[PDB]
Every structure is written in structure tokens, then in C-alpha cells.
């Protein structure tokens, strides 16, 4: 539908992704592309029980602080995260498309250091991805995600606004936290593809990067960012709630 310097939007990327996947590990994540297990069949709850469900910690006061620091160890399987800022990534660590979010899903391909597109399936050593994460009002995308060649997901995005207390009572919301801030909106504090703590911006490979959301249902949403309009479909679960915020 359209192509550009990086944004191969319109849902049509051609071959410029980096097809460097390794099968030495027997986890067989690549073989898990055809089918997805049930929620309670893959041992999700043990991995999903490490983060506080609804009310994590309360106020953090009015000032919207930015202390991105570094979030580098835990996997981004639940909406808790403090993703760091990534500008470039060697193309020897990517296995599949790198979907990035305007928030509307967008694909970024392999490019030369100087920016010349290269057509080598990312096999070449010099291949590198250039993605300087910047907010939509200043251009580029919030942040985005891919799969590392060993079989583990990755995330990256702009600084997340900081909020917390004193009794080990810190909540660093990377998205939403509507009631816990003076009107924190995804257009400001949004970092990754987590629109709200129980929603996702669905894309063709969503079930592959976050296979603990297989039970999620579909929805069609309309969002305004900056001074433009976005039509999007987001996947939110029907976990007991009132979805009219």
C-alpha cells in the first residue's frame, strides 16, 4: 500500500528483514509459529504472577518525572516495564520483522550505516537497524519490539514517566496510569505497544511475541495523537472490568 525510508506501512514489507534465526536451543520457539497453546497449558500464571494486577502503587505526586534509567533483565510479558532508549541494533540479533508502533503498527527494515537500503536478508555482518526512538509529536515512533535470535523477545521505547511512594511503593507506568497522574495519556507516557494495562495493539505477529495473550479478544478503537487521527484494532481481554473507562 505504501513504502518509505523506513516505514513499510500499509501492511506490506518485502524482504529487507533479517532472517538470522538459530535452532541450537531446543526450546523450538520457531516451531511454535503454527499453533499456540492454551493459557493454562503453557505455564503462564507463574510468569504472570510477578507483577501487581490492578492497584500497584498510588500517587507519585503531580510532577511527571523522566528517569528512564535502564530496564534490561525482566522479560516484557506483563505491562510492567521501564524500557530503555535504543537507537541502533546490529542486524545479527534479529529473527523476523521488527514491528514498530506509531502506535499504528509499522515495520522497519535493514539499512546501511549511511542509510542505503540493503537487500541481503540481514545475512551480511555489516547490516544494522537504525531506529532513533522519538515521540510522534517530534517524529518517529514511541518504541517497539522484535525477537532475538536465541528465542527471547525484546522491547525498547522512550523514557517512562515515574511515580512512587516510600514503602517500596514505586509504580513506573509505561502507559495509561490515567487515574494515578494528572491525566497521563498514551500520547505522552506511552512507550511500547501496551495501550492500557489490559490491552495490546494487535499486529499479525502479536501471538508470537506475547503468547500469554492468546485468550485476548478483538476490538476496534479510534485514537487521536497530537493533531492527527488513527484508526486501529486493539486486543483487550474481558477480564472482569468496565471497559468504558
Amino acid at each position: 500500500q505504501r513504502v518509505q525510508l523506513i516505514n513499510t506501512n500499509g501492511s506490506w514489507h518485502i524482504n529487507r528483514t533479517a532472517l538470522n534465526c538459530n535452532d541450537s536451543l531446543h526450546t523450538g520457539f520457531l516451531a511454535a509459529l503454527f499453533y499456540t497453546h492454551k493459557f493454562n497449558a503453557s505455564g503462564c500464571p507463574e510468569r504472570m504472577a510477578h507483577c501487581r494486577p490492578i492497584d500497584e502503587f498510588a500517587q507519585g505526586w503531580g510532577p511527571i518525572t523522566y528517569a528512564e534509567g535502564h530496564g534490561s533483565d525482566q522479560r516484557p510479558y506483563c505491562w510492567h516495564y521501564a524500557p530503555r532508549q535504543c537507537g541502533t541494533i546490529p542486524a545479527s540479533q534479529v529473527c523476523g520483522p521488527v514491528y514498530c508502533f506509531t502506535p499504528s503498527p509499522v515495520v522497519v527494515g535493514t539499512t546501511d550505516r549511511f542509510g542505503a537500503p540493503t537487500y541481503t536478508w540481514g545475512e551480511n555482518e555489516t547490516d544494522v537497524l537504525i531506529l532513533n526512538n522519538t515521540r510522534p509529536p517530534q517524529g518517529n515512533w514511541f518504541g517497539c519490539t522484535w525477537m532475538n535470535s536465541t528465542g527471547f523477545t525484546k522491547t525498547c521505547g522512550g523514557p517512562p514517566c515515574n511515580i512512587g511512594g516510600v514503602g517500596n511503593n514505586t509504580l513506573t507506568c509505561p502507559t495509561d496510569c490515567f487515574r494515578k497522574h494528572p491525566e497521563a495519556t498514551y500520547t505522552k507516557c506511552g512507550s511500547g505497544p501496551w495501550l492500557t494495562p489490559r490491552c495490546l495493539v494487535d499486529y499479525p505477529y502479536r501471538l508470537w511475541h506475547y503468547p500469554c495473550t492468546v485468550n485476548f479478544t478483538i476490538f476496534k478503537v479510534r485514537m487521536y495523537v497530537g493533531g492527527v487521527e488513527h484508526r486501529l484494532n486493539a486486543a483487550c481481554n474481558i477480564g472482569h472490568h468496565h471497559h468504558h473507562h
Partner: antibody
């Protein structure tokens, strides 16, 4: 139809992506007369990597040509039991249910 | 090896309800899908993911899955619903197709 000589090879072709986003995973299924269905392998247009079933590991080979936007499977060394109807399904990317079963192809061998 | 079993054949009278069961080992944790194959025709999808039904299939078809059995219940059967029915599941990175069940409506 024409009966294939034993020890020969056969090809089954399925429409494949021309080198862009596909959003479907291809598979091949066979049905011997009144014997149910069986699986052979898969193929993901985005990831050239193929997947082969345990039964037919040593005789199947899945490859595709993006220029012609066609993907085919080659089966070699046919025997009497390899007489059946060859289907070609196309299911969603990661839901694992096969929909839009295309027309079948019949191949016969003479013992 | 993983193997699925279903009754060889089921006979039902018009207007009644017929039950077809797909049985395995701890099948309750799999995502089954049912295929209807008429004589000499390509199979078509009739149920995917236990109970979700695609567009174009009448409301008569229904399904359920629990324990070690998956059920395909048909209510108000008529002469048009005579065909082979197959059960599907995924396991150990390999596809398994259950033994075909033949449904015949007595006249």
C-alpha cells in the same frame, strides 16, 4: 489419471507470496481412499524455513520460487501406498487451524 | 506417538440430536478444530478453537471441550448433514487428524 511409474517423483504446487507479507502458513495433506487424513509438512512464506513430518522425512522437500509466486513440494521414490489425493490448505499465521482447502490432486502408481 | 479416536459411525433420526466425540490424552488443553468432508469434496471448516464458529455455518452446529473428550453436537439434523467428520489437534510440533466418523441420517 496418468499412473506414475514407481521410483519416480511428483510435484504439488500451491500459490505462494511473491516476496511480501503473507499472513498465512501453507501445509499439505493427503487422503488415501477411505483412510482419513495425514500431514506431511508446512511452510511460512515470511520465514523460508520449512517443517517436515516424521513419517515422510526422507522423501519430501519443500521449496518455493518468489518470482513465480508459487511454492511446491517434491516427493521422491513413490510406492504403491503413495496413491491418494493431495490437498493444500492455508490457515492463519498463528491460530493453527486450516481453512480454505484448495482443490485436490489425484496421483496413481501401479504397484 | 499421539493418536485420536472417535466412534466409527453414528446414526440419528431427523429432528434429533447426534453426538460425536473426539477422545485423547489430556485433550482439554488443546485447541481442536472440526472438519466436515462430503463425498468427493474438499473438507471445509465447521468449528475452530472448541466453540467459535465461522461465518456461513448454521447455528445448529455446536461444540464443547473438557476433560478428555471434545463434542460436536448437531441439533435438528436433516438429510443435508450426512458426511464424514474429522477432529484435529496439535501436539509435539506435529499435526494429528482423528479417525473419520461417518454420520448417516436414516430416512
Amino acid at each position: 489419471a496418468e499412473v506414475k511409474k514407481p521410483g519416480s517423483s511428483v510435484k504439488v504446487s500451491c500459490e505462494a507470496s511473491g516476496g511480501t507479507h503473507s499472513n498465512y502458513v501453507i501445509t499439505w495433506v493427503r487422503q488415501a481412499p477411505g483412510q482419513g487424513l495425514e500431514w506431511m509438512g508446512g511452510f511460512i512464506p515470511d520465514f523460508r524455513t520449512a517443517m517436515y513430518a516424521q513419517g515422510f522425512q526422507g522423501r519430501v522437500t519443500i521449496t518455493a520460487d518468489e518470482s513465480t509466486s508459487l511454492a511446491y513440494m517434491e516427493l521422491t521414490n513413490l510406492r504403491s501406498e503413495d496413491t491418494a489425493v493431495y490437498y493444500c490448505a492455508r490457515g492463519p499465521l498463528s491460530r493453527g487451524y486450516y481453512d480454505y482447502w484448495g482443490p485436490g490432486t489425484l496421483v496413481t502408481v501401479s504397484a | 506417538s499421539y493418536v485420536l479416536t472417535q466412534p466409527p459411525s453414528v446414526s440419528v433420526a431427523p429432528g434429533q440430536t447426534a453426538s460425536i466425540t473426539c477422545s485423547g490424552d489430556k485433550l482439554g488443553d488443546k485447541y481442536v478444530s472440526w472438519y466436515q468432508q462430503r463425498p468427493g469434496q474438499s473438507p471445509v471448516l465447521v468449528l475452530y478453537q472448541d466453540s467459535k464458529r465461522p461465518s456461513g455455518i448454521p447455528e445448529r452446529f455446536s461444540g464443547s471441550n473438557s476433560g478428555n473428550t471434545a463434542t460436536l453436537t448437531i441439533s435438528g439434523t436433516q438429510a443435508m448433514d450426512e458426511a464424514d467428520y474429522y477432529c484435529q489437534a496439535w501436539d509435539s510440533s506435529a499435526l494429528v487428524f482423528g479417525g473419520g466418523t461417518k454420520l448417516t441420517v436414516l430416512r
